[PDB]
Write a protein that holds these residues in place. Structure first.
Motif, PDB file in Angstrom:
ATOM      1  N   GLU A  33       0.803  -1.215   0.000  1.00  0.00           N
ATOM      2  CA  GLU A  33       0.000   0.000   0.000  1.00  0.00           C
ATOM      3  C   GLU A  33       0.840   1.270   0.000  1.00  0.00           C
ATOM      4  N   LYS A  34       2.153   1.166   0.243  1.00  0.00           N
ATOM      5  CA  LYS A  34       3.019   2.330   0.364  1.00  0.00           C
ATOM      6  C   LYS A  34       3.922   2.556  -0.841  1.00  0.00           C
ATOM      7  N   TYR A  35       4.186   1.526  -1.639  1.00  0.00           N
ATOM      8  CA  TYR A  35       4.991   1.648  -2.846  1.00  0.00           C
ATOM      9  C   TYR A  35       4.123   1.343  -4.059  1.00  0.00           C
ATOM     10  N   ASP A  36       4.283   2.141  -5.114  1.00  0.00           N
ATOM     11  CA  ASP A  36       3.507   1.914  -6.326  1.00  0.00           C
ATOM     12  C   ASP A  36       3.904   0.614  -7.005  1.00  0.00           C
ATOM     13  N   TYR A  37       5.160   0.204  -6.859  1.00  0.00           N
ATOM     14  CA  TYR A  37       5.625  -1.080  -7.360  1.00  0.00           C
ATOM     15  C   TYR A  37       6.410  -1.777  -6.261  1.00  0.00           C
ATOM     16  N   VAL A  38       6.167  -3.073  -6.087  1.00  0.00           N
ATOM     17  CA  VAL A  38       6.974  -3.906  -5.209  1.00  0.00           C
ATOM     18  C   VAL A  38       7.427  -5.110  -6.017  1.00  0.00           C
ATOM     19  N   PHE A  39       8.746  -5.292  -6.131  1.00  0.00           N
ATOM     20  CA  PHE A  39       9.340  -6.320  -6.982  1.00  0.00           C
ATOM     21  C   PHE A  39      10.238  -7.235  -6.151  1.00  0.00           C
ATOM     22  N   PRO A  40       9.657  -8.083  -5.300  1.00  0.00           N
ATOM     23  CA  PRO A  40      10.472  -9.074  -4.588  1.00  0.00           C
ATOM     24  C   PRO A  40      11.061 -10.085  -5.561  1.00  0.00           C
ATOM     25  N   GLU A  41      12.141 -10.729  -5.119  1.00  0.00           N
ATOM     26  CA  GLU A  41      12.851 -11.713  -5.935  1.00  0.00           C
ATOM     27  C   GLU A  41      13.125 -11.160  -7.335  1.00  0.00           C
ATOM     28  N   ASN A  42      13.595  -9.911  -7.370  1.00  0.00           N
ATOM     29  CA  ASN A  42      14.011  -9.254  -8.607  1.00  0.00           C
ATOM     30  C   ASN A  42      12.858  -9.091  -9.598  1.00  0.00           C
ATOM     31  N   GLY A  43      11.623  -9.037  -9.100  1.00  0.00           N
ATOM     32  CA  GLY A  43      10.465  -8.845  -9.948  1.00  0.00           C
ATOM     33  C   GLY A  43       9.737 -10.109 -10.359  1.00  0.00           C
ATOM     34  N   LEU A  44      10.312 -11.290 -10.112  1.00  0.00           N
ATOM     35  CA  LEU A  44       9.631 -12.522 -10.494  1.00  0.00           C
ATOM     36  C   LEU A  44       8.276 -12.629  -9.812  1.00  0.00           C
ATOM     37  N   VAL A  45       8.170 -12.116  -8.596  1.00  0.00           N
ATOM     38  CA  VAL A  45       6.899 -11.775  -7.978  1.00  0.00           C
ATOM     39  C   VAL A  45       6.749 -10.266  -8.098  1.00  0.00           C
TER      40      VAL A  45
END
Ligand SMILES: [Cl-]
Ligand SMILES: [Mg+2]
Ligand SMILES: [Mg+2]
Ligand SMILES: [Mg+2]
Ligand SMILES: [Mg+2]
Ligand code: NA
Lengths: 242, 242
Positions: free
Chosen positions: B58-70
């Motif tokens: 809810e605080k970041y417009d994009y969240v890319f854990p595991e280098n974006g794979l999720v």
């Protein structure tokens, strides 16, 4: 202080993987009056502090984490041993290499990671890998029951490393336990031999032949008593030491 | 014409493996009045939550854990991918099997545990085992600098698996990373393709060759800036976004 009540951690003193209830922790310090107390478990000194408390070395007259391979007497460390120091690096590598090459020739639906978990008292070998999901764990267990992959692997291990002082067993749903002979809970008993106790009462739940207490429960040097739950454990001790 | 600031986590927003500060947490949300923000890191979503907060999506417009794979966008999950889904259990095992046989043949001073760690976006293959002590890591790294064990292995892998679309890089002192091509931090850029962002600023602290930010930093789709610590990350954004 002529007797010793040697308790097991899980299924005996606390709930499995849980913290000891404050009540049980009370009764153990109540019994400490009449006998010396102690704990033994295949859990490192940390898990023993998570469950029994950081002051575990002070709340008992013997702390035997990792089945006694790590040991304490009177809050002061006694000694430490490891499978590398017992078998030697060369044999450790010959076992790892056999298992790695063996697991590489097993055809599975899925393989993952941590096929060989190294611990100071045992190697945990898994053909699928101890990092598999729960669904993937079940898939292997069910298929293992029909194809008997772990059983064939245990047989080949006993033949490959015959007369090397090692015990191989099927452990749980996906793993295979490797440890020197007698490195079960019975290893903690060597730290008590020359202390001369009239009776060492052992307490544990896996007295079943095939469990992690059977050997110490059936060992001549102990008066085994099976316990169903910590509530049972405190009961038996109430009578033995009234 | 929107813009986006993509942040590395460890060493860029937070202190290494530590929790974000409130000054940086309040800076980023103040900054969200001027541009969209996102975070990309190798850690799984659970470690991102621990360090950046439980309301991270809810605080970041994009969240890319595991280098974006999720990937997460505007608080809703975009999509998820894993190595076993892109490559297939067929090939995953062909890779794991080769590495196990290979490792069983590497003569080392010592072997321990966790020779293959399975992650959703890579495999970490260590000849010694990623469960070894410091003094063991160093012993191996020293020998590795003199016999180039990992480099011989990396070269043999690249040949054995050429054409399968994989990348074999050396990581740390004892391991060899194995991941599909493109599955570094650059992977998250695919989720930003059709957004039409005029500028995608990137900030990272390991932007030199070997660091996990070098690929996304040098990628032409990004305007990269190298930071030393979260305080430097702040500084640069104050200039770029007055
Ligand atoms: Cl492994
Ligand atoms: Mg138990
Ligand atoms: Mg007996
Ligand atoms: Mg970083
Ligand atoms: Mg660039
Ligand atoms: Na480069």
């Amino acid at each position: 202080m002529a007797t010793l009540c040697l308790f097991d951690m899980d299924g005996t003193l606390t709930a499995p993987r849980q913290k000891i209830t404050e009540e049980m922790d009370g009764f153990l310090q109540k019994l400490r009056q009449k006998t010396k107390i102690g704990v033994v478990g295949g859990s490192d000194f940390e898990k023993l502090q998570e469950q029994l408390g950081n002051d575990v070395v002070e709340k008992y007259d013997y702390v035997f984490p990792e089945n006694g391979l790590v040991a304490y007497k009177d809050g002061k460390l006694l000694c430490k041993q490891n499978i590398q120091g017992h078998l030697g690096e060369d044999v450790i590598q010959d076992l790892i290499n056999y298992c790695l090459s063996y697991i590489a020739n097993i055809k599975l639906p899925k393989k993952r990671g941590t096929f060989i978990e190294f611990r100071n008292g045992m190697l945990n070998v898994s053909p699928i890998g101890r990092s598999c999901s729960q669904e993937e764990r079940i898939e292997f267990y069910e298929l293992d029951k029909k194809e008997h992959i772990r059983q064939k692997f245990v047989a080949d291990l006993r033949k490959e490393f015959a007369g090397k002082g090692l015990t191989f067993s099927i452990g749980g749903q996906i793993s295979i336990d490797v440890f020197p002979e007698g490195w079960d809970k019975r290893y903690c008993l060597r730290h008590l031999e020359h202390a001369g106790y009239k009776t060492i009462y052992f307490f544990g739940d896996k007295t079943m032949p095939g469990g992690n207490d059977h050997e110490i429960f059936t060992d001549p040097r102990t008066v085994g008593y099976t316990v169903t739950a910590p509530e049972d454990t405190r009961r038996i001790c109430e009578g033995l030491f009234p």
